Amino acid sequence: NKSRQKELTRWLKQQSVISQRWLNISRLLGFVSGILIIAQAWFMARILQHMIMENIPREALLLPFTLLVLTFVLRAWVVWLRERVGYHAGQHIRFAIRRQVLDRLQQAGPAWIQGKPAGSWATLVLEQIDDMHDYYARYLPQMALAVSVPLLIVVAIFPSNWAAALILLGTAPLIPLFMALVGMGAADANRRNFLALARLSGHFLDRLRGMETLRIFGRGEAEIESIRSASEDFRQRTMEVLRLAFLSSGILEFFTSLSIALVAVYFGFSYLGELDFGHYDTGVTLAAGFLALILAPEFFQPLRDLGTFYHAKAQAVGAADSLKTFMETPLAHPQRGEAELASTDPVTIEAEELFITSPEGKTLAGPLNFTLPAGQRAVLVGRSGSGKSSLLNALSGFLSYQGSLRINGIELRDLSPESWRKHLSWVGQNPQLPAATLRDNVLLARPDASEQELQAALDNAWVSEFLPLLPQGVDTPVGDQAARLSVGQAQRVAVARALLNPCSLLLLDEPAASLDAHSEQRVMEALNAASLRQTTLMVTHQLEDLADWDVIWVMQDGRIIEQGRYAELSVAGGPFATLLAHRQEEI
Amino acid sequence: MRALLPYLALYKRHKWMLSLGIVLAIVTLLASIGLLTLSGWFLSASAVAGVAGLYSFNYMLPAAGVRGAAITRTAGRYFERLVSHDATFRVLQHLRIYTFSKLLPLSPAGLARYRQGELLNRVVADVDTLDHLYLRVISPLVGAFVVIMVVTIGLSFLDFTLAFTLGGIMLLTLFLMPPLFYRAGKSTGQNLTHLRGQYRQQLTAWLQGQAELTIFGASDRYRTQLENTEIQWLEAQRRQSELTALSQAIMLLIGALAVILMLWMASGGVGGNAQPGALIALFVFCALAAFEALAPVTGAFQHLGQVIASAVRISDLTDQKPEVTFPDTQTRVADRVSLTLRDVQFTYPEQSLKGISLQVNAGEHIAILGRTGCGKSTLLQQLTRAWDPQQGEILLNDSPIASLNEAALRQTISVVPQRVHLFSATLRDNLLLASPGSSDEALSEILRRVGLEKLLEDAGLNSWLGEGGRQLSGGELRRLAIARALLHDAPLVLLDEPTEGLDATTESQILELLAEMMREKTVLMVTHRLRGLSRFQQIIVMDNGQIIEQGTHAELLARQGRYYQFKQGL
């Protein structure tokens, strides 16, 4: 869409206000560079005339050479200087955009982040923001130099000869006239061939990710021929696009060839006494022809580079396409009041017909009514299509609700998260260790805890019983996504992290879900005893050991449709009995 | 550059298209220099001749040279960009076939799913980088070298000393400057790949663990550490822009040195002539123009390091040893097959081991029960010959499994893998994969008979399906795996886990789907469920890699045993 395309670059050009000083020095230095180009073409033309027509020995021209050397050093200075100024332009926008992407990605919090994979956010922040650098560092300063420099040559040549300045200026409207005239084909070839090239670009990776399936059916030899067929079709379809895009590039190369040829043959003839016109009623000199001929290739040099830098606009608008939507999606946020609890003792959760709302707007849990007195241990069990984990997020503060979820008599919508979360500690599946060393992951809860109290958490969590296997023990590094520790050994650190605090509420989002046979026992052994001290609320799909838990809530599409202890509720024959049947039947 | 040799041998196929695309680059550059060199001489010779020499001066030959030089300058560039990109795609296809033809014998375990499958995006990206070698490295470098030599030889006919200093400066910067800048900016390029991956790691560990970091009160301390890495990363990026800025300034000073040297030296004497006249402009304009051939040469060498690195990864990844070898005997596929195992491991060994030693008759449906956490079965990996068994021997119809060639082994065994793949192709191609000779009617019947009536919609078989287009659900995707196995029509069928992650309303429907349609085949199933084991026979209960109980459901359940305990209770 061109309306979107127009408003995408409107976003791009309004992100440039940050570091507009750097984009003004670049535009100023493009004007200075366009003058030092004229200065050197005048000195070189005046030296050349002196030693060709007037037979002046080179030793008598030591002043123009000194100036000619000086305008080469200065002109090489601004090229070094405006490449550095141009970079500082691209670096500032990226830093400021990345700061308000991470900021926007932190206010939304865990609820929105887990909607997309982790590598999807890294592309948005690593790959999609570094794609806008060449737009501001190279492409944007070039549109300044593509309009400033060529006008300086036309202004400089005009006093000498208006016919030489009309050859250059005559092609100024002709180039965009013909570039757009052949641009209908480039906008047509990319309409018929857009769908197929989308399917073909990505075909090799698709066949490469399914070599296991190709192997088991004996189609390896017959998919080499499909790669051959899908590449012949890709080549000739993507050359019909390029064959029109090299006419646009070749048009500029045609008019620079015509202008250099017309300058050479107009001046060459006029010196010879044929084709007398264009000068201001004065004999055309050799230094006039040389100045025009030296500056003719440089009239189109700024426009040529703008063609090579145009791909930088292609990627920086695609990057702006995925970044403008991101910063404009309406997002829900907890009201995060200013109330604070005054009791370290376990809280009493009471809920009166509250819906848990995803940040995008849709509700995840229906009408919930429940009550947890102090010290009670609830448990939520469902068919994985229940959205029971959304209740845990709402208690954590990551989700917004339109009911009443007052904790200890105080509405959770009014609690300050920075002080409410001090009473909160939680465990969950797919545990994440962000800290560097295994000792620091545990101490992430509180770095002021005594090392003796550290040993209590490292012992009660059954994590000190596999520390000797690790190289350095407590201080062993934890690699990328906790690669050194197995998933069973990782969660026992997370349990040790939770046990390091005297929390008032504990939240277990399916611990021991994908753990091994033994690590699940060690986690459950330590985390059943921990749940007794303070009120908890645990999500499970292991229904075997729930006999000692105070109350059980089953969710079906987001409602508490049964309540009561395991013993009387197992034999009731409701959905839980059928729910437990599916658990017992699957060994 | 030794690692780049195996891929330069792929250029032998297109040595004419590749070489022509370089010849058109030199002709375009030679006409670029010739147009401005001839123009500079033509203006000087005309002015020196003057109006008094209008009839004497031969102005029709130089004025026809500028017409020819201005036509091949613009037509040669169009064809150069055209031929080069045509041949770039003809070696991309050759590269795509070459790696895919060498990753097939390594397909099951040679790759080994390393780096959590971040491997296959780096193979498409590395294959696309070996593509750039001709157009980003070879074409700019070979073209520039022989443009320098032609003008050096061409100017030699006028003056040897002038030609050698102009060409010598141009040759010297062609061979000295690119290596010096690649060597000067190698510490930063190393310090920038390391800081890019460090920021990416600190970011992923900050977004994945945002729930943990927020509640434990440290989401603003790891943001500071994350932001400090970006500051160090932006400094490495900045310091590689100061070299690019310094290399662009030095190229301008070197091209300035050549122009000034020609002005100062060609005015003294040209070709033994005290009064060179118009010759002075032939050299100062051949020095103004000839340095555009050197414009792409530093960036070309900078990329050769990236191309070489990619060639090493592709050479080590596809330069391995296949785990199995398939003898070629042209055997005949059996109509009925009886799988016989003898002391072969069921899963990988653990905690530091006799085999299964089961026997399956010609048409017996057999199920194998295993605990979820103990391990992942390697029976289908070994039965499809992903790797040779360390112990024991697999016999297919009383003959060792190694004797069957690849063509016939794939036809006796039809598996339904746990991880079933959606090829980005029409629904016909996802089904025609199994039986390549079926008709549009046969595919339609199977799609209905498996319960995929939704897919046979108005769009039909031709509907695009896969990554680009439609995505299937787990239950719907499971029926697609069975659809292929029914079309493949092998005597033996292996079922990795036919019902995993499916709800009871479709978990059941799959069971009579397998039972009603695989009744004549030697199906062997592996599950961690006890729903449909009733329709099977010789149920095998596996415990710690050993058969503890074996027998049909009723007989095995009637006697107290491990299978009896599985039925009721945890």
PDB file of C-alpha atoms in Angstrom, chain A residues 339-524:
ATOM      1  CA  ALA A 339      -1.213   0.452  48.647  1.00  0.00           C
ATOM      2  CA  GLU A 340       1.163  -1.808  50.578  1.00  0.00           C
ATOM      3  CA  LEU A 341       0.554  -4.761  52.876  1.00  0.00           C
ATOM      4  CA  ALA A 342       1.485  -4.386  56.541  1.00  0.00           C
ATOM      5  CA  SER A 343       1.687  -8.095  57.464  1.00  0.00           C
ATOM      6  CA  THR A 344       4.434 -10.612  56.735  1.00  0.00           C
ATOM      7  CA  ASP A 345       1.958 -13.394  57.552  1.00  0.00           C
ATOM      8  CA  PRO A 346       0.417 -15.315  54.629  1.00  0.00           C
ATOM      9  CA  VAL A 347      -2.226 -13.398  52.684  1.00  0.00           C
ATOM     10  CA  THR A 348      -5.888 -14.362  52.206  1.00  0.00           C
ATOM     11  CA  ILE A 349      -6.956 -14.253  48.557  1.00  0.00           C
ATOM     12  CA  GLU A 350     -10.636 -13.526  47.917  1.00  0.00           C
ATOM     13  CA  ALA A 351     -12.080 -13.212  44.412  1.00  0.00           C
ATOM     14  CA  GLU A 352     -15.585 -12.110  43.391  1.00  0.00           C
ATOM     15  CA  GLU A 353     -16.445 -12.735  39.722  1.00  0.00           C
ATOM     16  CA  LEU A 354     -13.270 -11.489  38.057  1.00  0.00           C
ATOM     17  CA  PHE A 355     -12.213 -11.923  34.433  1.00  0.00           C
ATOM     18  CA  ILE A 356      -8.490 -12.091  33.684  1.00  0.00           C
ATOM     19  CA  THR A 357      -7.755  -9.988  30.601  1.00  0.00           C
ATOM     20  CA  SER A 358      -4.854 -10.617  28.247  1.00  0.00           C
ATOM     21  CA  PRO A 359      -2.940  -7.439  27.304  1.00  0.00           C
ATOM     22  CA  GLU A 360      -4.302  -7.665  23.747  1.00  0.00           C
ATOM     23  CA  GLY A 361      -7.836  -7.386  25.193  1.00  0.00           C
ATOM     24  CA  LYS A 362      -9.326 -10.877  25.109  1.00  0.00           C
ATOM     25  CA  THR A 363     -10.275 -12.508  28.405  1.00  0.00           C
ATOM     26  CA  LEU A 364      -8.539 -15.693  29.533  1.00  0.00           C
ATOM     27  CA  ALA A 365     -10.558 -16.713  32.613  1.00  0.00           C
ATOM     28  CA  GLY A 366     -14.324 -16.490  32.987  1.00  0.00           C
ATOM     29  CA  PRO A 367     -16.260 -15.752  36.175  1.00  0.00           C
ATOM     30  CA  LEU A 368     -14.129 -16.991  39.089  1.00  0.00           C
ATOM     31  CA  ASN A 369     -15.283 -17.170  42.701  1.00  0.00           C
ATOM     32  CA  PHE A 370     -12.971 -18.605  45.351  1.00  0.00           C
ATOM     33  CA  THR A 371     -11.484 -17.891  48.764  1.00  0.00           C
ATOM     34  CA  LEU A 372      -8.103 -18.867  50.207  1.00  0.00           C
ATOM     35  CA  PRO A 373      -7.755 -18.277  53.960  1.00  0.00           C
ATOM     36  CA  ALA A 374      -4.287 -17.790  55.385  1.00  0.00           C
ATOM     37  CA  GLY A 375      -2.038 -20.831  55.088  1.00  0.00           C
ATOM     38  CA  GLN A 376      -4.387 -22.736  52.749  1.00  0.00           C
ATOM     39  CA  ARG A 377      -2.896 -24.610  49.762  1.00  0.00           C
ATOM     40  CA  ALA A 378      -5.143 -24.600  46.712  1.00  0.00           C
ATOM     41  CA  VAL A 379      -4.452 -26.401  43.452  1.00  0.00           C
ATOM     42  CA  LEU A 380      -5.734 -25.756  39.921  1.00  0.00           C
ATOM     43  CA  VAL A 381      -6.119 -28.729  37.575  1.00  0.00           C
ATOM     44  CA  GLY A 382      -7.542 -28.713  34.070  1.00  0.00           C
ATOM     45  CA  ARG A 383      -7.425 -30.030  30.508  1.00  0.00           C
ATOM     46  CA  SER A 384      -4.690 -27.588  29.352  1.00  0.00           C
ATOM     47  CA  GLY A 385      -7.397 -25.668  27.500  1.00  0.00           C
ATOM     48  CA  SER A 386      -8.589 -24.053  30.712  1.00  0.00           C
ATOM     49  CA  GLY A 387      -6.358 -20.991  31.049  1.00  0.00           C
ATOM     50  CA  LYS A 388      -5.663 -21.879  34.676  1.00  0.00           C
ATOM     51  CA  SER A 389      -2.137 -20.460  34.497  1.00  0.00           C
ATOM     52  CA  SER A 390      -3.646 -17.047  33.729  1.00  0.00           C
ATOM     53  CA  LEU A 391      -4.907 -16.882  37.316  1.00  0.00           C
ATOM     54  CA  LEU A 392      -1.338 -17.234  38.593  1.00  0.00           C
ATOM     55  CA  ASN A 393      -0.160 -14.404  36.347  1.00  0.00           C
ATOM     56  CA  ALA A 394      -2.970 -12.159  37.593  1.00  0.00           C
ATOM     57  CA  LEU A 395      -1.917 -12.770  41.194  1.00  0.00           C
ATOM     58  CA  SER A 396       1.685 -12.064  40.188  1.00  0.00           C
ATOM     59  CA  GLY A 397       0.695  -8.709  38.695  1.00  0.00           C
ATOM     60  CA  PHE A 398       1.330  -9.559  35.037  1.00  0.00           C
ATOM     61  CA  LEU A 399      -2.341  -9.458  34.002  1.00  0.00           C
ATOM     62  CA  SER A 400      -5.290  -7.090  34.308  1.00  0.00           C
ATOM     63  CA  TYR A 401      -8.688  -8.015  35.732  1.00  0.00           C
ATOM     64  CA  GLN A 402     -12.115  -6.364  35.759  1.00  0.00           C
ATOM     65  CA  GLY A 403     -13.495  -7.950  38.939  1.00  0.00           C
ATOM     66  CA  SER A 404     -12.363  -8.054  42.558  1.00  0.00           C
ATOM     67  CA  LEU A 405      -9.238  -9.934  43.638  1.00  0.00           C
ATOM     68  CA  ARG A 406      -8.537  -8.339  47.006  1.00  0.00           C
ATOM     69  CA  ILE A 407      -5.582  -9.859  48.852  1.00  0.00           C
ATOM     70  CA  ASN A 408      -5.629  -9.795  52.662  1.00  0.00           C
ATOM     71  CA  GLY A 409      -8.578  -7.402  52.410  1.00  0.00           C
ATOM     72  CA  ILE A 410      -6.775  -4.974  50.064  1.00  0.00           C
ATOM     73  CA  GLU A 411      -7.660  -4.815  46.376  1.00  0.00           C
ATOM     74  CA  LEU A 412      -4.752  -6.071  44.270  1.00  0.00           C
ATOM     75  CA  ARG A 413      -5.459  -3.337  41.713  1.00  0.00           C
ATOM     76  CA  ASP A 414      -4.268  -0.886  44.395  1.00  0.00           C
ATOM     77  CA  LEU A 415      -1.045  -2.632  45.459  1.00  0.00           C
ATOM     78  CA  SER A 416       2.248  -1.101  44.406  1.00  0.00           C
ATOM     79  CA  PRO A 417       3.953  -3.888  42.418  1.00  0.00           C
ATOM     80  CA  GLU A 418       7.440  -2.980  43.637  1.00  0.00           C
ATOM     81  CA  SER A 419       6.384  -3.638  47.244  1.00  0.00           C
ATOM     82  CA  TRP A 420       3.743  -6.313  46.657  1.00  0.00           C
ATOM     83  CA  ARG A 421       6.183  -8.571  44.797  1.00  0.00           C
ATOM     84  CA  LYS A 422       8.521  -8.603  47.805  1.00  0.00           C
ATOM     85  CA  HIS A 423       6.001 -10.936  49.463  1.00  0.00           C
ATOM     86  CA  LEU A 424       5.826 -13.043  46.288  1.00  0.00           C
ATOM     87  CA  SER A 425       8.040 -15.964  45.294  1.00  0.00           C
ATOM     88  CA  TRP A 426       7.119 -18.467  42.626  1.00  0.00           C
ATOM     89  CA  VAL A 427       8.266 -21.512  40.676  1.00  0.00           C
ATOM     90  CA  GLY A 428       7.188 -22.623  37.227  1.00  0.00           C
ATOM     91  CA  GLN A 429       7.986 -24.885  34.243  1.00  0.00           C
ATOM     92  CA  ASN A 430      10.732 -23.950  31.705  1.00  0.00           C
ATOM     93  CA  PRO A 431      12.656 -22.210  34.574  1.00  0.00           C
ATOM     94  CA  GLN A 432      14.914 -19.280  33.509  1.00  0.00           C
ATOM     95  CA  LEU A 433      18.300 -18.537  35.138  1.00  0.00           C
ATOM     96  CA  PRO A 434      19.363 -15.018  34.081  1.00  0.00           C
ATOM     97  CA  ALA A 435      22.283 -14.602  36.474  1.00  0.00           C
ATOM     98  CA  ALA A 436      25.848 -15.630  35.680  1.00  0.00           C
ATOM     99  CA  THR A 437      26.940 -18.136  38.334  1.00  0.00           C
ATOM    100  CA  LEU A 438      24.850 -20.830  39.993  1.00  0.00           C
ATOM    101  CA  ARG A 439      25.522 -19.160  43.341  1.00  0.00           C
ATOM    102  CA  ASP A 440      24.274 -15.837  41.979  1.00  0.00           C
ATOM    103  CA  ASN A 441      21.077 -17.343  40.531  1.00  0.00           C
ATOM    104  CA  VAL A 442      20.109 -18.471  44.028  1.00  0.00           C
ATOM    105  CA  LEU A 443      21.203 -15.129  45.497  1.00  0.00           C
ATOM    106  CA  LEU A 444      19.140 -13.299  42.862  1.00  0.00           C
ATOM    107  CA  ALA A 445      16.330 -13.317  45.433  1.00  0.00           C
ATOM    108  CA  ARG A 446      18.379 -11.291  47.933  1.00  0.00           C
ATOM    109  CA  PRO A 447      22.134 -10.591  47.696  1.00  0.00           C
ATOM    110  CA  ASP A 448      22.293  -9.620  51.392  1.00  0.00           C
ATOM    111  CA  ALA A 449      21.461 -13.138  52.602  1.00  0.00           C
ATOM    112  CA  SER A 450      24.158 -14.681  54.773  1.00  0.00           C
ATOM    113  CA  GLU A 451      26.164 -17.551  53.319  1.00  0.00           C
ATOM    114  CA  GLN A 452      24.881 -19.736  56.158  1.00  0.00           C
ATOM    115  CA  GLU A 453      21.301 -18.986  55.098  1.00  0.00           C
ATOM    116  CA  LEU A 454      22.422 -19.678  51.532  1.00  0.00           C
ATOM    117  CA  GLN A 455      23.431 -23.196  52.569  1.00  0.00           C
ATOM    118  CA  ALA A 456      19.921 -23.735  53.944  1.00  0.00           C
ATOM    119  CA  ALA A 457      18.361 -23.112  50.526  1.00  0.00           C
ATOM    120  CA  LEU A 458      21.070 -25.065  48.693  1.00  0.00           C
ATOM    121  CA  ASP A 459      20.420 -28.006  51.038  1.00  0.00           C
ATOM    122  CA  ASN A 460      16.629 -28.016  51.411  1.00  0.00           C
ATOM    123  CA  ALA A 461      16.218 -27.862  47.619  1.00  0.00           C
ATOM    124  CA  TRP A 462      18.348 -30.989  46.998  1.00  0.00           C
ATOM    125  CA  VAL A 463      20.658 -28.943  44.775  1.00  0.00           C
ATOM    126  CA  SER A 464      23.806 -29.402  46.886  1.00  0.00           C
ATOM    127  CA  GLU A 465      23.574 -33.138  46.114  1.00  0.00           C
ATOM    128  CA  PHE A 466      24.634 -32.605  42.489  1.00  0.00           C
ATOM    129  CA  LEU A 467      26.978 -29.656  43.053  1.00  0.00           C
ATOM    130  CA  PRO A 468      30.115 -31.881  43.309  1.00  0.00           C
ATOM    131  CA  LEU A 469      29.384 -33.194  39.808  1.00  0.00           C
ATOM    132  CA  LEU A 470      29.641 -29.608  38.557  1.00  0.00           C
ATOM    133  CA  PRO A 471      33.181 -28.300  37.889  1.00  0.00           C
ATOM    134  CA  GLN A 472      33.385 -25.338  40.277  1.00  0.00           C
ATOM    135  CA  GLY A 473      30.440 -26.206  42.525  1.00  0.00           C
ATOM    136  CA  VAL A 474      28.322 -23.259  43.624  1.00  0.00           C
ATOM    137  CA  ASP A 475      30.311 -20.870  41.424  1.00  0.00           C
ATOM    138  CA  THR A 476      30.147 -22.860  38.188  1.00  0.00           C
ATOM    139  CA  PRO A 477      29.032 -20.727  35.227  1.00  0.00           C
ATOM    140  CA  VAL A 478      25.543 -21.327  33.870  1.00  0.00           C
ATOM    141  CA  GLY A 479      25.698 -21.269  30.092  1.00  0.00           C
ATOM    142  CA  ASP A 480      23.277 -20.041  27.467  1.00  0.00           C
ATOM    143  CA  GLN A 481      19.692 -21.002  28.456  1.00  0.00           C
ATOM    144  CA  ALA A 482      21.264 -22.983  31.340  1.00  0.00           C
ATOM    145  CA  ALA A 483      22.960 -25.445  29.008  1.00  0.00           C
ATOM    146  CA  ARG A 484      25.383 -26.864  31.587  1.00  0.00           C
ATOM    147  CA  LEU A 485      22.541 -27.822  33.932  1.00  0.00           C
ATOM    148  CA  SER A 486      19.897 -30.245  32.746  1.00  0.00           C
ATOM    149  CA  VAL A 487      16.255 -29.204  32.990  1.00  0.00           C
ATOM    150  CA  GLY A 488      15.937 -31.398  36.062  1.00  0.00           C
ATOM    151  CA  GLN A 489      19.052 -29.793  37.609  1.00  0.00           C
ATOM    152  CA  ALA A 490      17.982 -26.279  36.541  1.00  0.00           C
ATOM    153  CA  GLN A 491      14.577 -26.280  38.307  1.00  0.00           C
ATOM    154  CA  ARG A 492      16.208 -27.331  41.594  1.00  0.00           C
ATOM    155  CA  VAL A 493      18.087 -24.026  41.476  1.00  0.00           C
ATOM    156  CA  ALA A 494      14.804 -22.194  40.877  1.00  0.00           C
ATOM    157  CA  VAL A 495      13.305 -24.015  43.863  1.00  0.00           C
ATOM    158  CA  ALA A 496      16.385 -23.022  45.863  1.00  0.00           C
ATOM    159  CA  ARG A 497      15.797 -19.448  44.701  1.00  0.00           C
ATOM    160  CA  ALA A 498      12.204 -19.471  45.964  1.00  0.00           C
ATOM    161  CA  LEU A 499      13.129 -21.032  49.317  1.00  0.00           C
ATOM    162  CA  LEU A 500      15.595 -18.223  50.082  1.00  0.00           C
ATOM    163  CA  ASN A 501      12.810 -15.844  51.144  1.00  0.00           C
ATOM    164  CA  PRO A 502      10.056 -15.919  53.802  1.00  0.00           C
ATOM    165  CA  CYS A 503       7.403 -15.195  51.202  1.00  0.00           C
ATOM    166  CA  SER A 504       3.780 -14.526  52.076  1.00  0.00           C
ATOM    167  CA  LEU A 505       2.398 -16.145  48.902  1.00  0.00           C
ATOM    168  CA  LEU A 506       3.890 -18.910  46.754  1.00  0.00           C
ATOM    169  CA  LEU A 507       2.818 -19.593  43.167  1.00  0.00           C
ATOM    170  CA  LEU A 508       3.708 -22.859  41.424  1.00  0.00           C
ATOM    171  CA  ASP A 509       2.972 -22.792  37.682  1.00  0.00           C
ATOM    172  CA  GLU A 510       3.301 -26.511  36.955  1.00  0.00           C
ATOM    173  CA  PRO A 511       6.640 -27.320  38.600  1.00  0.00           C
ATOM    174  CA  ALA A 512       8.101 -30.738  37.835  1.00  0.00           C
ATOM    175  CA  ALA A 513       6.316 -30.714  34.477  1.00  0.00           C
ATOM    176  CA  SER A 514       9.058 -31.919  32.111  1.00  0.00           C
ATOM    177  CA  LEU A 515      11.555 -32.964  34.787  1.00  0.00           C
ATOM    178  CA  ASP A 516      13.133 -36.406  34.841  1.00  0.00           C
ATOM    179  CA  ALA A 517      11.969 -39.231  37.094  1.00  0.00           C
ATOM    180  CA  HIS A 518      14.301 -38.350  39.969  1.00  0.00           C
ATOM    181  CA  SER A 519      14.559 -34.558  39.780  1.00  0.00           C
ATOM    182  CA  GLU A 520      10.762 -34.359  39.839  1.00  0.00           C
ATOM    183  CA  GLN A 521      10.778 -36.284  43.117  1.00  0.00           C
ATOM    184  CA  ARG A 522      13.395 -33.972  44.639  1.00  0.00           C
ATOM    185  CA  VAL A 523      11.540 -30.838  43.526  1.00  0.00           C
ATOM    186  CA  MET A 524       8.195 -32.181  44.748  1.00  0.00           C
TER     187      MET A 524
END
